[PDB]
Nucleic acid binder design. Structure first.
Length: 105
DNA sequence: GGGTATTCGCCGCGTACCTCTCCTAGCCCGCAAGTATCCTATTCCTTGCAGCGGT
């Protein structure tokens, strides 16, 4: 498994695309339609910034990954994930959240 | 969502020794060597100007 992939909890395909400069990823993406870490195609990024030339940041590549990682709190995420793992559901999400919590702790 | 099947990709496949060969490709710029050419002489001829005896 890829430690980045499941620490940040993003499918490895999308990090593969981002880290070789063929897409865009939002960093904070607040005060707008976008979420924390949506992926964008080049044209999608151009269109989004056109309609939303406000301050939402969407970077491209290693710098974006670094900012996204450095912009996270570990133990708080651990609390949220253990609360969610409390139940709903112990079928495969049980295994997934146990692994992610193991890495985070 | 969720239990399940199917696919993709990574990991692995004996020890010790002996002999031999071969180990980047391509451009480029100084540079040695070798050469064809150009200026350098000699001999003949017919002019153009300065001295010069002569009166």
């Amino acid at each position: 498994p890829s430690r980045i992939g499941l620490l940040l909890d993003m499918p490895l395909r999308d990090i593969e695309r981002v880290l070789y400069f063929e897409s865009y990823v939002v960093i904070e993406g607040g005060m707008t339609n976008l979420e924390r870490q949506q992926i964008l195609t080049e044209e999608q990024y151009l269109d989004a910034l056109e309609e939303f030339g406000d301050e939402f940041d969407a970077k491209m590549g290693a710098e974006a990954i670094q900012a996204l990682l450095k912009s996270m709190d570990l133990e708080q995420e651990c609390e949220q994930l253990r609360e969610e793992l409390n139940e709903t559901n112990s079928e495969t999400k049980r295994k997934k959240l146990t692994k992610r919590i193991k890495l985070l702790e």
